Amino acid sequence: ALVVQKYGGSSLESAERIRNVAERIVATKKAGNDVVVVCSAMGDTTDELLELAAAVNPVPPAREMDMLLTAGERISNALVAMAIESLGAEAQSFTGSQAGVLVTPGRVREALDEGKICIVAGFQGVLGRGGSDTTAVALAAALNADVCEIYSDVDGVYTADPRIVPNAQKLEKLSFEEMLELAAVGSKILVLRSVEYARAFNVPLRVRSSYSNDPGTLIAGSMEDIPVEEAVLTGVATDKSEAKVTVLGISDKPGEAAKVFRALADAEINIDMVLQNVSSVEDGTTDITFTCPRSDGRRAMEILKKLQVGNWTNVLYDDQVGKVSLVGAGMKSHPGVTAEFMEALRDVNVNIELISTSEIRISVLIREDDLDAAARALHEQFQLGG
Amino acid sequence: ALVVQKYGGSSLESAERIRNVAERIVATKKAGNDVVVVCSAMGDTTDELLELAAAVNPVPPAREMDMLLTAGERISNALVAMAIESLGAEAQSFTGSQAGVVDVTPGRVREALDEGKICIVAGFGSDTTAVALAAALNADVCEIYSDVDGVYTADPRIVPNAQKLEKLSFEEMLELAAVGSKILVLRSVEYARAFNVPLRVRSSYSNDPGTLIAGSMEDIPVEEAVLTGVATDKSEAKVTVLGISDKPGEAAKVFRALADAEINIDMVLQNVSSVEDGTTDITFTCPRSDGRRAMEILKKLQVQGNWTNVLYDDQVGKVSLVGAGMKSHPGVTAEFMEALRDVNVNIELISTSEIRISVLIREDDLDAAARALHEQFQLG
Amino acid sequence: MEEAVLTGVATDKSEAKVTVLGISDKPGEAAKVFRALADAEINIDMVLQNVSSVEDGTTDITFTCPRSDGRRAMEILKKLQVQGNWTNVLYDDQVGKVSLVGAGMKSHPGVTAEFMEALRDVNVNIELISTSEIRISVLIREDDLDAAARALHEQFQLGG
Amino acid sequence: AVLTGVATDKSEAKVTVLGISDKPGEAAKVFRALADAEINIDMVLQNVSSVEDGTTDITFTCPRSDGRRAMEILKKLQNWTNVLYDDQVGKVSLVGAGMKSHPGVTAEFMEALRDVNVNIELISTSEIRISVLIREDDLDAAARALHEQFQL
Ligand SMILES: C[C@@H](O)[C@H](N)C(=O)O
Ligand SMILES: C[C@@H](O)[C@H](N)C(=O)O
Ligand SMILES: C[C@@H](O)[C@H](N)C(=O)O
Ligand SMILES: C[C@@H](O)[C@H](N)C(=O)O
């Protein structure tokens, strides 16, 4: 088969883990697979290198940032290739660009046909974007890989955070959309931009650990192609990293949303979720609530309060909020799922302050103190554990 | 004018330090010069990378090794570049391969400098390519920046009365570093000599001009020439082979076995044989780390009729006097020996070039000997 | 790190929205409303509840459902109003829904701003907002779908 | 390692003071003698002393014209076993830099000369050169071998 493998910094922390990962890569080829490996920088190098850049220059220019981050990933590349060749494999190295960034993986297909393990790392031509993860998926789409594996210290996607919900289980498979949604509101399990490429170009992803031989969790197939009878509820996501800001009493006219979110975007405030219900017929106003990292809260409030004097009657601040969500294709075409969710929390006396949704997700905002209780309630309500 | 500037790992140890270095680079541009910069990797990155390479594969392929070390040096290239552009300059990075060389041919670099850019050259050592570009571009000077602020008449901590040289010849510098401490890469100073590119050893922590290395001794007036400094070395072992037949090929047997085993020889020495017996002795110095393995080899051949015995000494110290002023003048060699006699230091071994006197002695006397030599001559 | 992958713009005019007004903000009140719909087999899609006023301690809950099940939906609720539970139940069968689908929108806040600015500059009023890291959805008048899509297409340069 | 060239010489004469005591101040005596006679010094070579005896020999070179005079200068100052004169000595050097880290240069120098059967009498090297005293006539046959060995 054709297998793409992306190893994160945790997997390449040291020389021994590199050699260890080198043997896994060779074992994979030995099993009759053409292998492409993508390399993150060793350990926390990319974070440390980003700091340095910012230290030597705020707003570092693009070209040199590309040279810097590439260099860091090209170290891992050198070491892994070195190890690969130690064990009998023949290695050919590429910068994520030398294999087309765009698409256009001609050079890599040559090397594979000659029995070489191809390593890809860094960038040089024209970044963005997701880094090694999306390079791995983009290469998997272009080369037409049967799977793109993502190795880290994470051994799979679970039905809930096992630290919170003891009866939580590891998923075998889920759809792209189900992963996207779970990753969107709580998880933080992998780069979503790369998972959106995998959805877009139909490339199966597998999240597994480079420390065990556990097969991990598979992300494959759209939930649009899942039979209605077989669709299931997937997991429960939590997030206590957010604060919520509510602008009270914005008049319901074109542009008023712009006046709020232009201010926040110019102030570099990161917006996780935005929520606006219908306006009151008398007085003609509604409220806009949005969440952001707690590190941006203080400043978001400062901005919108300056804009409060006109435009709106108040701006509220709340940095003790948590978010619990249910995700599953099974709720698309099944009434009463929302009902069971609301009853679930009711029976554990958790109050629902705010609600948002998608086709296959329900999210509520609650007191952070209620998170653990709410998650366990939801998990056992829909019987996700074993 | 054209200035080349090399900055080592120490000079680029941190961001704040990189930004400080960056201001100096822009200052040199602003002073009215085309500036080219060569960066080593930050701090000890190259050593840490070399450690890492050996750990993943005991005999690394050259290709992946090129990639590994190039990456390390290209981190500081990037950061220096970023720093330089925040100060107003337009940076232009080169790997060294597509800079000039391979043997040097810097078409691209000259093109970039004509556009008023500051060229940053990383890695395919660092010093040798800096001077090689300096020679290729016909640079007015190649500046080596580090924590050392110039060449001194002696080791300042050993000789309190030591002084910083304003200038010395290429071959004077070569000789001082050939026996004393490696302040510059010996290899890089020979290109300077070969191609007549002035070098300036100076500090990246101060505005001190440092020491100039310029011109040949051969084009210095014979009256004007002076003694340059005193060099000490307590890092060498001393090995002597007794009873080696004075016939062609025997010296070759010795140094082949030492070459094959990777024993770094230094200051090899042999005197005339004895007509009685027809045999001579060959003494050489090597690093103390090699001494044991060097001995193991020569002894195995010793116990095979090749020669009598192989002596070993890892408490030897080397002290030397350098200066173009001794090549044509008599009695300096005499004043040297007298200086050590008067401080009760015995000369075990003696070796020279036309402008260097070197003597092996007990390392316990090194300090006293260097101190004696320093004030015996004008130095300080 | 900073750039967000955007994959396309979607419109939909298949549903109506129902709005329960003045639901008291205490545990179990949401359950009342959605259990009623569940018992009547009304498959609802998007639900949105914002924060309750300090003055009343009440909120509104708006949800969408297939346009056919629309009037039915509001009527189940409207018939179970008797108590103090809610003041009114509204019904809108002319509502549309435009959305920007993609990924990594949290750290590219300018996208959200540009979304509102797109619809603003084609004089389209955003009536409800429900977004996330991989989704920006707004409800507007069904007649403004044409002009919303062209604005969002032009702004983000999306298609194919 | 870098190698710049190969220089020969026929301008000098070597002088070996045999059996000098390996105690302090004995070298001074020898060279203060030549310093008084104002015979300009070049090479000096003294190896380690005998264990049996307790003495070494000091070989030095000087401008060939001053060679016989210099030999007979040290004869007057005599503890020492003998003094020898030589004026058919030739010097061949390999000039360069960084030869400590590459010992094959030192070996191949000595291998290149054995393959031409040339008498290697003295040796006095460092990081930046490898000089050896051979017989004057073998200078060119010595050079050719070095030129071919290290490609200069
Ligand atoms: C944002 C919302 O309150 C307003 N109707 C607008 O579209 O600007
Ligand atoms: C050792 C030396 O004297 C000898 N002539 C040789 O080179 O073999
Ligand atoms: C308003 C509604 O969500 C209520 N807080 C509940 O928990 O049911
Ligand atoms: C030079 C040597 O023969 C003697 N030991 C001295 O110091 O004078």
Secondary structure (H, E, C), A141-209: HHHCCCEEEEEECCCCCECCCCCCCCCCCECCEECHHHHHHHHHHCCCCCCHHHHHHHHHCCCCEEEEE
The letter for the amino acid at A240 is: K
Task: Confirm if B225 and B327 have CB atoms less than 8 A apart.
Answer: yes
- Does the distance separating the beta carbons of D114 and B334 come in below 8 Å? no
Sheet (strand A273-276) strand order: A314-318, A242-251, A285-293, A273-276, C128-132, C135-141, C95-103, C5-12
Could you tell me which of A242, A236, A250, A226 has the C-alpha nearest to residue A173? A226
Q: Which residue's alpha carbon is at the smallest distance from atom 4 of ligand 4?
A: D22
As given in the structure block, the two tokens for residue A376 are: 């366990």
What is d(CA A148, CA A349) in angstroms, rounded to the nearest whole number?
43
Same domain, yes or no: A217 and A227: no
What is d(CA B122, CA B133) in angstroms, rounded to the nearest whole number?
12
Structure letter (DSSP) for residue B304: I
Specify the resolution in Å.
Answer: 2.6
What is d(CA A192, CA B262) in angstroms, rounded to the nearest whole number?
54
Closest ligand to Cα C35:
3
Same domain, yes or no: B1 and B45: yes
| Pairing mode of beta strands C88-92, C15-24 | antiparallel
Length of chain D: 152
As given in the structure block, the two tokens for residue B162 are: 């030591």
Length of chain B: 380
Residue A41's alpha-carbon distances to A71, A76, A148, A302, B347, in angstroms, are: 9, 6, 19, 38, 56
A378 burial class (0-12, 13-18, 19+ CB within 10 angstroms)? buried
| Pairing mode of beta strands A91-94, A117-120 | parallel
Element (H, E) at C89: strand C88-92
A359 burial class (0-12, 13-18, 19+ CB within 10 angstroms)? middle
What is d(CA D40, CA C159) in angstroms, rounded to the nearest whole number?
91
Which residues are A318's β-sheet partners? A244
Mutate to test the pocket of ligand 2, among D45, D89, D120 (most ligand atoms within 8 A of CB): D120
Q: Give long-range contacts, CB 8 A cutoff, 24+ apart: B298-305.
A: B298/B239, B298/B241, B298/B254, B298/B257, B298/B258, B301/B253, B301/B254, B301/B257, B302/B241
Task: Confirm if B140 and B35 have CB atoms less than 8 A apart.
Answer: no
Task: Confirm if B28 and B3 have CB atoms less than 8 A apart.
Answer: yes
Residue A256's alpha-carbon distances to C82, C115, C120, in angstroms, are: 37, 12, 8
Of chain A residues 316-335, which have a CB less than 8 A from chain C? Answer: 316, 333-335
- Does the distance separating the beta carbons of B67 and A74 come in below 8 Å? yes
- Does the distance separating the beta carbons of B351 and D126 come in below 8 Å? yes
As given in the structure block, the two tokens for residue A63 are: 């070209």
The letter for the amino acid at A23 is: E
Which residues are C103's β-sheet partners? C5
Query: Of A184, A201, A222, which closes a domain?
Result: A222
Task: Confirm if A321 and A353 have CB atoms less than 8 A apart.
Answer: yes
Sign of CA dihedral D6, D7, D10, D15: negative
As given in the structure block, the two tokens for residue A23 are: 């043997």
Q: What are phi and psi of A71, to 5 degrees?
A: -45, -50
Same domain, yes or no: A254 and A204: no
Q: How far is the CA of B246 from the centre of ligand 2 (A)?
A: 5
Query: Of A170, A194, A222, which closes a domain?
Result: A222
Task: Confirm if A135 and A191 have CB atoms less than 8 A apart.
Answer: no
List alpha helices for chain C, DSSP H: 29-39, 70-79, 110-121, 145-156
Query: Of B152, B182, B216, which closes a domain?
Result: B216
Sheet (strand B167-168) strand order: B91-94, B118-121, B34-39, B2-7, B141-146, B199-203, B211-213, B167-168
Q: What are phi and psi of B34, to 5 degrees?
A: -75, 125
Could you tell me which of B159, B174, B216, B192 has the C-alpha nearest to residue B377? B159
| Pairing mode of beta strands B34-39, B2-7 | parallel
Structure letter (DSSP) for residue B164: B
Which residues are D5's β-sheet partners? D95
The letter for the amino acid at D78 is: Q
Residue B63's alpha-carbon distances to B66, B70, B124, C48, in angstroms, are: 5, 11, 11, 59
- With H, G, I as helix, E, B as strand and everything else as coil, classify residue A117: strand
Same domain, yes or no: B110 and B12: yes
DSSP string of D121-147?
-EEEE-SSEEEEEEEGGGHHHHHHHHH
Q: Does residue C34 sit at the A interface (CB-CB below 8 Å)?
A: yes
Closest Cβ opposite residue A19 in set B56, B71, B83: B56
Q: Angle A256-266/C110-121 helices, nearest 10 degrees?
A: 150
- With H, G, I as helix, E, B as strand and everything else as coil, classify residue B125: coil
Task: Confirm if B274 and B280 have CB atoms less than 8 A apart.
Answer: yes
What is d(CA C140, CA C126) in angstroms, rounded to the nearest whole number?
5
What is d(CA B27, CA B364) in angstroms, rounded to the nearest whole number?
47
Same domain, yes or no: B228 and B212: no
Task: Confirm if C44 and C36 have CB atoms less than 8 A apart.
Answer: no
Element (H, E) at A306: helix A294-306
Q: Give long-range contacts, CB 8 A cutoff, 24+ apart: A202-205.
A: A202/A141, A203/A137, A203/A140, A203/A141, A203/A145, A203/A147, A203/A148, A204/A146, A204/A147, A204/A148, A205/A137, A205/A147, A205/A148, A205/A149, A205/A150, A205/A179
Domain count, chain B: 2
- With H, G, I as helix, E, B as strand and everything else as coil, classify residue A116: coil
- With H, G, I as helix, E, B as strand and everything else as coil, classify residue A249: strand
List alpha helices for chain B, DSSP H: 15-30, 45-56, 62-86, 107-114, 126-137, 170-179, 186-195, 250-260, 288-301, 332-341, 366-376
Element (H, E) at A238: strand A233-239
What is d(CA A287, CA A356) in angstroms, rounded to the nearest whole number?
15
Structure letter (DSSP) for residue A240: -
Q: What is the extent of the structural domain holding B275?
A: 217-380
| Pairing mode of beta strands A173-174, D44-46 | unpaired
Question: For residue B149, what is the domain's CATH number?
Answer: 3.40.1160.10
As given in the structure block, the two tokens for residue A307 are: 């804009």
Q: Does residue B309 sit at the D interface (CB-CB below 8 Å)?
A: no
| Pairing mode of beta strands B141-146, B91-94 | unpaired
What is d(CA D112, CA D115) in angstroms, rounded to the nearest whole number?
5
As given in the structure block, the two tokens for residue D27 are: 């070298």
Check chain A for breaks (C–N over 2.5 Å) and list the residue before each, or none.
102, 126, 309
Question: Ligand 3: does its nearest atom lie under 6 Å from the Cβ of C30?
Answer: yes
Closest Cβ opposite residue C103 in set A192, A333, A335: A192
Q: How far, in whole angstroms, is CA B366 from its chain's centroid?
A: 21
Domains of chain C: 1-13+94-160 (3.30.70.260), 14-93 (3.30.70.260)
| Pairing mode of beta strands B118-121, B34-39 | parallel
Residue C145's alpha-carbon distances to A75, C8, C10, C68, in angstroms, are: 51, 15, 10, 20
* A367 labeled part of a ligand binding site: no
- C29 CA: nearest ligand 3 atom: 8
Task: Confirm if C73 and C18 have CB atoms less than 8 A apart.
Answer: yes
Residues 6+ apart with CB under 8 A from D125: B265, B267, B268, B269, D99, D106, D131
What is d(CA A297, CA A269) in angstroms, rounded to the nearest whole number?
8
Same domain, yes or no: B157 and B237: no
A85–chain C nearest CA distance, Å: 32
Q: Which residues in A80-155 belong to E strands, given as ranges?
A: 91-94, 117-120, 147-152
Sign of CA dihedral B220, B226, B230, B236: positive
Same domain, yes or no: A228 and A373: yes
A103 burial class (0-12, 13-18, 19+ CB within 10 angstroms)? exposed
| Pairing mode of beta strands A2-7, A147-152 | parallel
DSSP string of B240-288?
EEEEEESSTTHHHHHHHHHHHTT---EEEEE---BTTTTEEEEEEEEEH
What is d(CA B295, CA A30) in angstroms, rounded to the nearest whole number?
47
As given in the structure block, the two tokens for residue B179 are: 């026996």
As given in the structure block, the two tokens for residue C9 are: 């713009």
B87 contacts on A by Cβ (under 8 Å): none
What is d(CA B269, CA A16) in angstroms, rounded to the nearest whole number?
46
Which residues are A207's β-sheet partners? A150, A217
- B246 CA: nearest ligand 2 atom: 3
What is d(CA B2, CA B138) in angstroms, rounded to the nearest whole number?
8
Determine the residue of chain B that is closest to A61 in CA distance: B82
Residue B351's alpha-carbon distances to A263, B81, D53, in angstroms, are: 79, 47, 22
The letter for the amino acid at B189 is: V
- Does the distance separating the beta carbons of C46 and A181 come in below 8 Å? no
Q: Is the peptide bond prior to B19 cis by the omega test (within 30 degrees of 0)?
A: no
As given in the structure block, the two tokens for residue A148 are: 């793109």
- With H, G, I as helix, E, B as strand and everything else as coil, classify residue A308: coil
Same domain, yes or no: A171 and A244: no
Could you give the count of Cα atoms lying within 13 Å of B355 in the half-sphere of its Cβ? Answer: 26
Same domain, yes or no: A211 and A231: no
As given in the structure block, the two tokens for residue D53 are: 């005896």
* C106 labeled part of a ligand binding site: no
Which residues are A205's β-sheet partners? A148, A219
- Tokens 């002597």 belong to B240
Q: Please, what's the b/e burial string for B164-201 (b: 16 or more CB within 10 A of its CB; e: otherwise)?
A: ebeebbbbbbbbbbbbbeebbbbbbbbbbbebebbbbb
Same domain, yes or no: A150 and A281: no
Number of A/C CB contacts below 8 angstroms equals 200
B101 burial class (0-12, 13-18, 19+ CB within 10 angstroms)? middle
Tell me how the structure was determined: X-ray
Residue B260's alpha-carbon distances to B239, B283, D102, D105, D128, in angstroms, are: 17, 18, 11, 12, 21
| Pairing mode of beta strands A217-219, A173-174 | parallel
Q: What are phi and psi of A87, to 5 degrees?
A: -100, 5
Radius of gyration of chain D (CA): 17
Q: Does residue B289 sit at the D interface (CB-CB below 8 Å)?
A: no
As given in the structure block, the two tokens for residue A270 are: 């990161």
What is d(CA B373, CA B152) in angstroms, rounded to the nearest whole number?
14
Task: Confirm if C158 and A292 have CB atoms less than 8 A apart.
Answer: no
Could you give the count of Cα atoms lying within 13 Å of D140 in the half-sphere of its Cβ? Answer: 1
Radius of gyration of chain A (CA): 23
Q: How many C-beta neighbours within 10 Å does residue A298 have? A: 11
Same domain, yes or no: B123 and B246: no
Number of H helices, E strands in chain D: 4, 8
Same domain, yes or no: A275 and A290: yes
Question: For residue A289, what is the domain's CATH number?
Answer: 3.30.2130.10
What is d(CA D93, CA D5) in angstroms, rounded to the nearest whole number?
8
What is d(CA C146, CA D148) in angstroms, rounded to the nearest whole number?
85
Structure letter (DSSP) for residue B332: H
As given in the structure block, the two tokens for residue C73 are: 């939906």
What is d(CA D16, CA D33) in angstroms, rounded to the nearest whole number?
14
Structure letter (DSSP) for residue A211: S
